[model samples]
Target: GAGPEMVRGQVFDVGPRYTNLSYIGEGAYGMVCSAYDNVNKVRVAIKKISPFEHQTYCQRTLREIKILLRFRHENIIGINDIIRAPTIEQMKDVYIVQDLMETDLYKLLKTQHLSNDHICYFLYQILRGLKYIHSANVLHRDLKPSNLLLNTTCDLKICDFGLARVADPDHDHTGFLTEYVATRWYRAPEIMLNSKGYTKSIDIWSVGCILAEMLSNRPIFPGKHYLDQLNHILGILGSPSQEDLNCIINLKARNYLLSLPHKNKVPWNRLFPNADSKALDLLDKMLTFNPHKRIEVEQALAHPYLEQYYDPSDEPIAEAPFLPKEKLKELIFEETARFQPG
Candidate 1:
């Protein structure tokens, strides 16, 4: 709310290992700000968790912290500090410090004319981060333009793990995951159908949406109702093939699809008149209606659209699958230490 200066005096008591604090902006679950970290000699972000929302929100913050701490990747945002309230009476908010990205892809797309180079580079970076994420058996359930952070160099990092999950990568078939995670426009068809299942390919589907948005600077499937979201997907991707249609297990969702008027897949060239065929080729498989048929991240990284950009050696994967270092007890215990016994 404050222009540049941090107006919330009460909130700025996050002790002085850092200096030059300025309120960045308020978010759905927290207030963020920029600060100078003398130790790192770089600008960093501070997030004060917005409590009183729900315990669900509070639980997610810790999961985010665990994932950020465990995975060290160039294309993933890193955390530098975690600050807790000094007394149990004031335990409503916790502060975390992290890299201060210049902006997000959503904002960047709106404000600038993206050269093909920009689109290619950004998409490469996203897939690079995602490969690492999927390698660690993690699901970035919410991948959209807004969660991709960027610096002046066009370097993008994946952020906001509040909606991410560490799933068992190599399970029999589908892993039961949260029913709803991704933003509507970026959500995969499998998720929207209430499949109650997740696969790494769902994240790939999101990348397709982001790539389309990057080309057009608007959401590819901006919809209102949940059903409306499905309409956009089917409208552009065409009615699901019989084999794919049978993949839907939700009675209502399956029946709904069966009842829909037959629609044909729209031509990608028509959507982006002058867009590169290679780019469209990659997006085509990435946006495949069936999760079983989508392209893998490793294959995606090598696609011709990014032939000149993607470097296999440079795009790394996690050395080992992430094992949560600290569960909830450790987090609550750490803060409980700050409690002043009555």
Candidate 2:
């Protein structure tokens, strides 16, 4: 516990090592900030979740710890430590300490459409990460571009576990569930319909969407509401086939019908006509409406899109620059109740 000794400057219950710089982002649950690591003499990113310590869903801090503890993969951000603040009077506080990462994949795509090499590299890493998590029986319920991180190494790492859950093997019922799960744009068709039972395929569907975004340089489906999401899917890909519709959850009795106006083209050619054909092929498979038809993570990884151009054996080491222990302190505890309400 005794590592770096704080100077005799300002006396308090405990002076934090990290000094807050500026706000990076404020999500539905917590705030991310750019923090200074006085110990390492570098700037690092830190996500502060102090506000969520009381709420049930806000317990995502602990959930993230539990999830990350179970799976370790190259395309995953490493949690350096779980820093529990020194408490007084038997009270408690905890912080989820993680390595500082660069901007999210979504933000990166906004500037430019990814080159073929970048797309393969990103998807391969993303799929590999998902493969590891899925094999561990863990499901990343929210698999959006914002949740995917690209570190200084230019390697992609899947971060955030607020909506992740270890999946059930026995539940075969299909379709998506809870609008609360995946983001509207990336959410699968089944999920948009309120499918109660689903599987790891839900995450794969998101992967497809991210791929589309990477190629399109914009979100494929920017649906602000539920109907817009459904309409977006039906607009392209010409509505789910009868067999695909059969997989719809709890719609066995009702005559479910989806019409495709064909007003909007698939936009594959317009988006990535110059991209590797294999990439286009795999993207189609990923966006398939039939959850049963969606390719598994491993299979998607094996797709020729990556196989053709990416030589995994000769690729450079994916070393993400993590903040030192002291830097961890600097990146975390900067914002206290004095300046801002904790």
Candidate 3:
């Protein structure tokens, strides 16, 4: 019903208000593109909700939308608007409009020559965003480098906020499934193994691995298999202590770990010889095998490595926490469906 705007071989049939559409990249969620917002006079990124649009996972798709709309922080990727398809030739869903970030940390980390300041400020912003997220009684279960969106001006915002289904420790059978396979190297040891009392520390472990990646330009634990991941972690961290081992529920798995050599923990300085000692100190605490002993976000921020960027006044906490409801979610999805063009 409108002029065709094609990017690469793909056609972007969006609202009349957008022009100059260009393909960004295909993400796990959907194909992404950047478009000129003719009405607003700014560039915006748009994605069509693909994999979960037409079937059994509508509730999960709606969860992503709700979380995106619920969060309002500079460091959390903000959703500007969503356009229901102008035409139904694609029989399509809504097009999510978000800020046109220059790149994601996944791409940036690979090519950019980073400095000490870049690392410190990047970590500072991540903690600042994460502090608000955890304060709001939420966990970004998937906090890998790729999910961290970055602007050209050194602004970093956490994206893919709704992808995680929290690993609530109370449940004997945990379902850690999501839309994509989140990188294993960034996963926390407790999550990789059977452990209870899963807390906000899960994200902190990822942050630690991410920081180490930023320093060494490599994943701290580059594992091939799930169990291989544990070995990579244990290779540096050594075997778990009996107290830490007690948290493991898998008796047979614990027996195998018990059989491993009692190797001493490796020094962070040995891995990152030229890096700042202060940075390594925080990484040391954040990567603690026991999730209970992991560095708190507040404490991590207070550490001297990020002292240049830390301001207690600036770290805002959410006044109210995000509480999900079962029936409420269904009602909300139905209401939203009514808005979809027929």
Candidate 4:
């Protein structure tokens, strides 16, 4: 990749093949910019990931690339190319090129209210993407609106796989998972409880949070922190029942639930007073406390809520690439090797 050299004021040659037009967004992992791909004669979003020395940063960068490469769906963003550092000195950063989009669901929601059709369509795309990801034995882990990319037509695409993980059912029982994975507002109760194990259902819970925000025009559970986040959820969904609490494998988490004062769940109608009745029914199932009880992506696609917009042809191709634990480690090594001096 070329070092910053101004081609025209703010516009600069980002790499040998792409011209950075302007900065679009920035985060802990990287800075994104709108760029022109001279070789392809098209526009693209270039994310320049920094701090290659950080283990988490390197892991996430490689994880995002691997996961995106495995997907081929309208709702999931496509990776155009990955540009590694040219030499050891410049190895602190790498570039990821992807299809450009106008906005994300978070920004769009702030600007205007979506019609019921728009909501359904956007959600359908999300579920479609989740269905594909989950079927591939992967968990998005992070599914907030900010990660849901959108265009002017309200076409939504799920992006940002930095926090994602390949969910092996045999491996999930290992009792090692992070509680601080997904964004607080959109995180599921099971995740918040720091469950000993998790499943694809965690992603469904996040989708429920996103759906609620789309309908209400605000986050359903916007907590300042994890504890506050759990309180916000409990306040709305009510305290868990004794049976529900028993399902929690973590003794500390189970005790915490028992100690909390009981709170009756807010009625779904009251929560989403203007939302479609069918939509509410589906939301209820997605937001359930028990992961076993929460609606799976497959079941959600068949739910009456989206029956009108459901298309059998829209289903993701069942075939997906898989990486064994050993292969995954090898891939990570190769990902890092690109930055090493030959």
TM-score of each: 0.87, 0.77, 0.87, 0.88
lDDT of 2 by residue, 102-184 (tens): 78887888765677788888888888787777777777778888889887667888988777766763664443334454568
Which pairs clash inside model 1?
none
Q: Which ten residues in a row have the lowest lDDT in candidate 2?
A: 6-15
Quickly count the clashes in candidate 4: 0
Q: Show model 3 residue runs off by greater than 4 Å.
A: 4-11, 27-29, 51-57, 85-91, 166-169, 172-181, 195-198, 323-342
Candidates, ranked, TM-score: 4, 1, 3, 2
Q: Model 1 Cα displacement at 197 (Å)?
A: 5.6
Which segments of candidate 4 are over 4 A away from where they belong? 1-3, 6-13, 86-90, 169-179, 196-198, 323-342
Candidate 3 lDDT over residue span 1-342, tens digit each: 558677655556676777777777775446788888886898898886553333323555666677767778889986787666433443344567888888888788898867888999999999999998888777787788888888879999998754554435455223222112456888777655653224688789999999998998888899887677788999999989989888765766568778888888999999999899999999999999988788999999999998898898999987766723444334444534543556
Once fitted onto the true fold, the runs of candidate 2 whose alpha carbons sit more than 4 angstroms away are 1-15, 38-42, 51-55, 86-93, 169-178, 252-267, 308-342
Residues 1-342, model 1: lDDT tens digits: 332234465456564666677877776678888888776788888887755346666567767877877789999997777776664456666677888999999898888878888899899999999999998888888899989999988889999888777774354243223246468888887766644335788789999999998888888889886667788988899999989977766567678788899999999999987688899999998999988789999999999899997788888888778513234434643633532233
Poorest stretch of ten by lDDT in candidate 3:
172-181
Residue pairs clashing, model 4: none
Q: Which structure is stronger by TM-score: 1 or 2?
A: 1
lDDT of 4 by residue, 1-342 (tens): 447644222323356678656778777756778888887898899877764546666677778877887688888897877676554554445677899998998988888898999999988889988888888888888899889998877788899988888875455432213457568898877766755234788799899999999998899999998678888889989989878887776777777888898899998899888999999999999999878888989899999989887776767754775544344434554664543346
Task: State the displacement of the C-alpha of residue 325, model 2, in Å, after optimal TM-score superposition.
Answer: 30
Collision pairs in model 2: 18-330, 176-190, 176-191, 176-195
